[PDB]
């Protein structure tokens, strides 16, 4: 009956005539609560996964914080209006339309230095829960190979550096044309060069969310 419901949020969402409440780890009526914790209002938050694990210093990365009971029952109705996501002392702004009681989505702000083991604090009105697995990284391109290629494009361009797999998405480009990705990793980004109509040199520009990174010029030989 009342134990049909599995989460604290779902438990307090049950219709009033059923008279269900949350008893620490179980949804049950008050007469069967054996701890002094039975409630129809209180729901403490809990995180178990956060992806992606890291963002470039410029930020712009949209996080996805999976967990339980991120909401707040105001006036006997849950919403995420009381929900606050703190990345350290700054806040990640929530997207309500893509968020729910058990999963949150929020865009991180800028950082000035690298930070490792950053703490994600989430308050839901009743309590707070912490998550120390996030990093502000600073992606760098150490080199590119080869330094030149045909105007036909299709050259296997290898970018080399660190933290090149942080954040939401990679966009390498050269000459204003897209350099289509082959493989992504912390240290290596492989991509095939676009076909140019001009014989000249171009810098290889890498885009990671709001972060921009340039490197050595790449010549298009004729």
């Amino acid at each position: 009956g009342c134990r049909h419901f599995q989460s604290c949020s779902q438990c307090l969402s049950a219709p009033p005539f059923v008279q269900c409440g949350w008893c620490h780890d179980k949804c049950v009526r008050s007469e069967e609560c054996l701890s002094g914790t039975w409630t129809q209002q209180i729901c403490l938050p809990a995180i178990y996964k956060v992806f992606p694990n890291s963002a470039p210093l410029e930020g712009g990365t949209r996080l996805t914080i999976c967990g339980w009971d991120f909401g707040f029952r105001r006036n006997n109705k849950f919403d995420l209006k009381k929900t606050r996501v703190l990345l350290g002392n700054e806040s990640c702004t929530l997207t309500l339309s893509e968020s729910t009681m058990n999963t949150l989505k929020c865009t991180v702000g800028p950082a000035m230095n690298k930070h490792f083991n950053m703490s994600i604090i989430i308050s839901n009105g009743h309590g707070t829960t912490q998550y120390s697995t996030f990093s502000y990284v600073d992606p760098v391109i150490t080199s590119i190979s080869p330094k030149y290629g045909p105007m036909a494009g299709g050259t296997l361009l290898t970018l080399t550096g660190n933290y090149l797999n942080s954040g939401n998405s990679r966009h390498i480009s050269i000459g204003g044309k897209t350099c289509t990705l082959k493989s992504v990793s912390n240290s290596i980004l492989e991509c095939y060069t676009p076909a140019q109509t001009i014989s000249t040199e171009f810098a290889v520009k890498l885009k990671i969310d709001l972060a921009n990174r340039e490197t050595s010029i790449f010549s298009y030989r004729e």
Partner: antibody, heavy 120, light 108 residues
Framework: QMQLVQSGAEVKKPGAPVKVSCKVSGYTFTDYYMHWVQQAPGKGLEWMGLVDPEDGETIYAEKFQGRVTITADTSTDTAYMELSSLRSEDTAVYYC?????????????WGQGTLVTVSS | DIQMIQSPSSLSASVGDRVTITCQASQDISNYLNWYQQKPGRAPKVLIYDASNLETGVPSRFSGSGSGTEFTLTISNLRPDDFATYYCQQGDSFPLTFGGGTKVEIKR
């Protein structure tokens, strides 16, 4: 129906503080958030920030961060909006608004507005 | 950061016309959008919640539709009191942003 009764028009010198009040009646003041909204002459609506009357929490827009202070007196069912250090730019009608029961943010109820002119 | 873009900024219409007002959002806001009406000298009043639901008291001549990033406010059977400024507003994320406004005016 609900009443958001705001205070009257203001004429402050530049640099002076101003405090606009918003007394409410018709519902329980602590149940809902309270937005404040700015409207410069001939211009659109612009969200300033909000307050949760139940605990006193505030959320400001970046543009008014540090300069505006929204407060809420639960003893008199009144929300205040103080703007320290007025600039000439700050001449505008200021609205207070009750937050909607929708899952998302919205302005359910509105006050009549308060003209704060700023001139030397 | 989410930017609401209304179009047109103004339009002319005779009484009894079907007016249509559009509203673009820079990001997908689902149906988390409100329309307001502001006549000169007065505070705005809510017209529509959830992009399509009329507020209690609003005539059925009004209707909103759209989802994600594109929204409309249609005004069938235009009436003299409908000449006013209309604003869209997203409530999906901070800061809360309004559109630039659409002024409906009497055609002459």
């Amino acid at each position: 129906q609900m009443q958001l009764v705001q205070s009257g028009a203001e004429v402050k010198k530049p640099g002076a503080p101003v405090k606009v009040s918003c007394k409410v009646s018709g519902y329980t003041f602590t149940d809902y958030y309270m937005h404040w909204v700015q409207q410069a002459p001939g211009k659109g609506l612009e969200w300033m920030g909000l307050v949760d009357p139940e605990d006193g929490e505030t959320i400001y827009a970046e543009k008014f961060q540090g300069r505006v202070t929204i407060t809420a007196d639960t003893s008199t069912d009144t929300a205040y909006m103080e703007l320290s250090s007025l600039r000439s730019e700050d001449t505008a009608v200021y609205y207070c608004a009750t937050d909607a029961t929708t899952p998302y943010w919205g302005m359910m109820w509105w006050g009549q507005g308060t003209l704060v002119t700023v001139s030397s | 950061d989410i930017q609401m873009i209304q179009s047109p900024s103004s339009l002319s219409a005779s009484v009894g016309d079907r007016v249509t007002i559009t509203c673009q959002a820079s990001q997908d806001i689902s149906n988390y959008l409100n329309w307001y009406q502001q006549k000169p000298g007065r505070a705005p009043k809510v017209l529509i919640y959830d992009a399509s639901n009329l507020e209690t008291g609003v005539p059925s001549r009004f209707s909103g539709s759209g989802s994600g990033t594109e929204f409309t406010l249609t005004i069938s059977n235009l009436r003299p009191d409908d000449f006013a400024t209309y604003y869209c507003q997203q409530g999906d994320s901070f800061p809360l942003t309004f559109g630039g406004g659409t002024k409906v005016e009497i055609k002459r």
